[PDB]
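Help wanted!
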Amino acid sequence: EVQLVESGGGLVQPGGSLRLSCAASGFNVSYYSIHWVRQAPGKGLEWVASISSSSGSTSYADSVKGRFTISADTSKNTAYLQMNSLRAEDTAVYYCARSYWYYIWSYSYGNAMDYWGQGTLVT
Amino acid sequence: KRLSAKKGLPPGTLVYTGKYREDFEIEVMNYSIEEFREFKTTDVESVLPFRDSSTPTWINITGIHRTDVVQRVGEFFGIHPLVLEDILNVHQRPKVEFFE
Amino acid sequence: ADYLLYSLIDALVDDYFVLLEKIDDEIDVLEEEVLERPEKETVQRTHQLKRNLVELRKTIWPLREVLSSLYRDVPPLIEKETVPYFRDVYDHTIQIADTVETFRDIVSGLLDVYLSSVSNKTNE
Amino acid sequence: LVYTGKYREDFEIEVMNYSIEEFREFKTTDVESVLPFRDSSTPTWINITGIHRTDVVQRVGEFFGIHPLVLEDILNVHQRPKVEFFENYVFIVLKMFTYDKNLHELESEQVSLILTKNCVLMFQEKIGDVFDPVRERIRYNRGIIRKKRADYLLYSLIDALVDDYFVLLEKIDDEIDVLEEEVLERPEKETVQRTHQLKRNLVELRKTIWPLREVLSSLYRDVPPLIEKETVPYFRDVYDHTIQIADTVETFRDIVSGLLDVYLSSVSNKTNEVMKVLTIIATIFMPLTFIAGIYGMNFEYMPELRWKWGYPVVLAVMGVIAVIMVVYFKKKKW
Amino acid sequence: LVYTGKYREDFEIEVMNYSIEEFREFKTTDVESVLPFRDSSTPTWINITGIHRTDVVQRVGEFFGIHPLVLEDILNVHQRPKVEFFENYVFIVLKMFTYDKNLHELESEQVSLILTKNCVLMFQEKIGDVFDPVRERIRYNRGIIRKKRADYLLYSLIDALVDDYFVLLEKIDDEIDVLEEEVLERPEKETVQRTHQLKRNLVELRKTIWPLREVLSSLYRDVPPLIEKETVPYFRDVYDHTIQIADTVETFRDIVSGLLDVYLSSVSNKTNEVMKVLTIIATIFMPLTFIAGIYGMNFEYMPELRWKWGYPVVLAVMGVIAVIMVVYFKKKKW
Amino acid sequence: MEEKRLSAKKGLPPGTLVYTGKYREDFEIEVMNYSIEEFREFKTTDVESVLPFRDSSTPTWINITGIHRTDVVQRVGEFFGIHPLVLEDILNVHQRPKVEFFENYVFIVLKMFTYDKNLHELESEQVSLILTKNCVLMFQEKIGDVFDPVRERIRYNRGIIRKKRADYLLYSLIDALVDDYFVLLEKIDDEIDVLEEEVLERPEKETVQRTHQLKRNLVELRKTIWPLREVLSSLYRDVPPLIEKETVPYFRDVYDHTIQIADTVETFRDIVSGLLDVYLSSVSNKTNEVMKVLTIIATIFMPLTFIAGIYGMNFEYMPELRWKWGYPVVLAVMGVIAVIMVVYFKKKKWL
Amino acid sequence: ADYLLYSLIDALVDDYFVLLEKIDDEIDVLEEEVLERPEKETVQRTHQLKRNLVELRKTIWP
Amino acid sequence: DIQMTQSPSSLSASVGDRVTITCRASQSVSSAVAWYQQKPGKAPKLLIYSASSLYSGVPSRFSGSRSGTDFTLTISSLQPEDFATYYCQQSSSSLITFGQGTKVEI
Ligand SMILES: [Mg+2]
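Answered by r_m:
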């Protein structure tokens, strides 16, 4: 039922730009937070960015802060990652996932990525 | 009023506080003097149109870890967001509040 | 629908009574355990029961307040004919509170009896 | 005007004038340079790191029109947090907490704030602060802090204090986890002292968090003409954060208080087994010591003939008595 | 009519009349001079310290027209705090507490407040009160009290009472930490007496605080027959302060009970250690004595004889049995 | 929940009403009829003498003492129209305080206590009130009550009791009972102080029994005080049509007094628990002292006894020759071992 | 037959009353013994009586 | 920034034995630690959240624990399907950081 479909991966020359689109089915992006996780060839998962579509809250990793911009169209139920000024270190399999918040203490919170996407390759 | 600000969450976020994230179901039991209807589903759109039904209705939403369903039901029924947060907050004591 | 709300609250209080019956059974088991064979597990279980009863009191005392608010100020949602039915639930909540306080007294007695029985074994 | 604190080591003034176009940062020892900063329309932040040297605070209060008893409250560091409103300024007293993981001890430091026209007069007892993120945010353009007045600066400082309150809560959470694991795994003597010390520290945190909650509630609910309504929601957010802190402190108190009862219920039952061991061994070896001495008197009135192995049959009687007594113990399942 | 208080010392009528423009003070030695300050427009604060003479109280009551039962309640000290809203005035009784070091007990002083017209009458048993901050505010034109009416003066007096209650609770917190030090570092038998004294003091504190909470709740719960409004929002803070006072008293009682439980656990642990040492010594040395009895029973013929000079062999057997017992004891955590 | 009926008792005929209490020594009826102008007061033993006061316009206070005479209770109940179940509740002493509202009357059950010194047990009497039309009916088991102030107020026209109706009379009776509860709490406080002094100064065996009896007494006091608080809450909030909506603040005052009483009872229970903890601490300390002296004596003597008995026997191979003053050397070794044990015990802070 | 069921249940309750009679006699004797002589058999008797009363509750209340 | 360090980098184990992987956090993370299983060529699969809570639809073999800032993932009995790379992240801040992985091999 709940599926996340990703698109927009392709080969881009260094210094170029491309937009990754994440199609959401089975849920509404307003009530959840959509994350981007990239996995370089032969290396572990790296967190890219996140957004809560209900508000304008956004967060970016220090590695790609400033060069990447995240957004979402609530009407289209799609989340985007506008990634510009690419380098050779930015090539990876980009994953799109949604997360939910859980409760530890009153002051402490955490999120876990229950549903993931198939993945797209960007060079 | 207003949603309480939580340091570590985006503004306006609704979070389930308890532990149980296993099951989810909605069971509507509409009844009247002469006839009744019993009905179970996992879709909120089939339980929404009972808001304006004249006969008494008993909608039972099992599983509040699905915050989206709670928010949609509260929006359709006009329930205040603070009341939704109170619903999702499990670390409480019994209380009753009266609204218009 | 107000009668439906009354019915749901009545069912909840009935299950509270069933829970109190189960707790009384467990208290009888504990009292049998303490008098005959004192042990570390016995005092552990007695303190666990004490904590459970404290939580039960902290839960049941607001229930009387919410039932009182339900049947006294009579908001427009609850009709006048439904008001007599909530008084029965309020009285049931009062009974449950009395029972949990009695259980608190009994478990305090059990705390005393544990040391008394240990002293008796040492005396022998 | 006497200083009742314990810190009398260093003195330092930190001044930070900022606006939309450019900031200014300098640490000055002479107090005369900070005085002409009151007339500037742009917001400014004078941070006094040492308040033990009384002439500086006296001069600053006299120049800024601060009532002398407010100066006394500034110097009095053993004071509960509070907020008092004036037609010319708002006076805030807060507390600063640092916690050590190596040695479990909670200490408090008093900080005072004055917001008069555009100055945020920060009075601090000692070196070491909480508001480094605010300094970083105003050194490099990174937020709304450089587009609003000094009331927003007061908000930023209070928010930073609450944030490191959250950090302290995180450290205490780790301590509670470790202590609970230790209690459940390896009870030991100093663990009881650790539990009680943590309980008392939590009580102190509760008693110091309630006045902070009152401070924020007074700050946002009843807005003074100087705070301005454009900042009230920010203070309400900080008030909600303080509510979170209070709830977390309460739940830590509840959970740690339970750990203390674990040791209480885990003791006072080691007497029985050793008592039974002593009882059985004494029971076995008292009659057998009475015998072998009853015949070992050297009484020499008994005939000296060994007879049919008198000593071996006495040993056999010893063994028979021991076996019978062990059988009786088994019958009583001792 | 009759004086219940046990204080018979010098009495002073400290009359303080203040306004926006000016203020005055005069200690007086005669009651007739205070009487003109009945219908004065400016609010007046009269402190009739020393009730050992009933004539002065009776004359003041007759001049102000208060009911004789109010005088009877003023004279009666041993009574819980209460508030009564008469048609012409409001009668409030409060108790001031002080805790003395060395000897562990605390004394209570009943203070009665009457608010009529534009006058506040305070009656005290002895010299020494909790209202010095109010005097400092009045003398130095600090705050709002000069601008407002006598209702704000009553508010300030009650707030000062609760503030001194807070500092007193800090003093008992210090006493609790000293008792904790005594319990942990050096348990003894006087620990029980000290803990019981602290518990009784806390119980008395609860007895004197909960009626005060009821009084402030009654004051805040509308019905301001003589309060000129705009002052009851200030009463909200004091009620919350009483809530916090009661909660802190409950926490102190809980931690003292926990200290008593830890002391009992320590006593039982020392009992168990004595158990262990006595059992170890008896188990080590009783069977060895039995063996030395049978191996050493004075008989004419010893069947073992001089089996390769076996007296050191007998000692070696003793040592083997002893080390076997030591190994058995060391197998467990004994 | 619905319908009321007389409960069937196996050992009784179907319609029998039985007095449950123990008091059968006395019986009288006291009537205090009063109005704004004049009051009329008399005592009697004829049940017919009090019946025609049912229709009196001025408030009437009929006090029936000696409810062991069920005939009088039944005559009054059938004359005034009281339900047989209410009469059974009146005669059932083994009960807890309760309130009950009917169309024509309100039925209230209360308890009064008399704590006795030198015999540390408290005995309760049951008093029942029925407020109907212009009459208040009071039923007691034995002479001796707590309503003398009300009688004096009616007699000497003190207060506002004469101007008002029977509602104020019911309020006054309940207020007097609550005041007697306060007096009982004062007596219990004195008892607790005596026990505290005893436990702190002279702990003996009878402390167990006295403190446990006090604890049981406080438990019974709570069990009878909580329903009283509920009764006053119901009277203050439900407001049946028999109260005229003018005396409600008085009932709220009595409710506040009951809350104070319950709070005092809880504090007393806490103090008694503390006393038990103190006594157990003293017992444990004395046990420690006695077996510490036992253990130190055993440790300094028994190993020494074994070591001395090792050399106290005769074997073929043994240092028969005096090595270097062997016997004094052995005695010195024994003394050194004893001194070492004493020093080691002193290290552990023992005696 | 419903009245027959009623009669059988009534006979059950009557025999429960008969049982309570013996329980009362035993309690009276045991209380006198406990108040008079603290014999080692008295504790066993009282504990057995307590167990019997617990069983009686668990049966009568349903 | 919060750095999570995993040990061992690679693991070898048979079928039916006990496997333990430990994660260590540079700074204090309360319990916002999760475990993910990623077979090669596929997306990760959530196993544990809150450092001790088993996710729905996940076999009961997997478990987690917390000891201060030390987090351990344990598999009671290994299975042929359990040979994959395991990661630990922290969610105590908006800046979420993953571990370096732990590839379990036959
Ligand atoms: Mg010999």
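OP: Thanks! One thing I noticed: The helical segments of chain E are 54-64, 68-75, 132-139, 150-185, 190-220, 232-294, 311-331.
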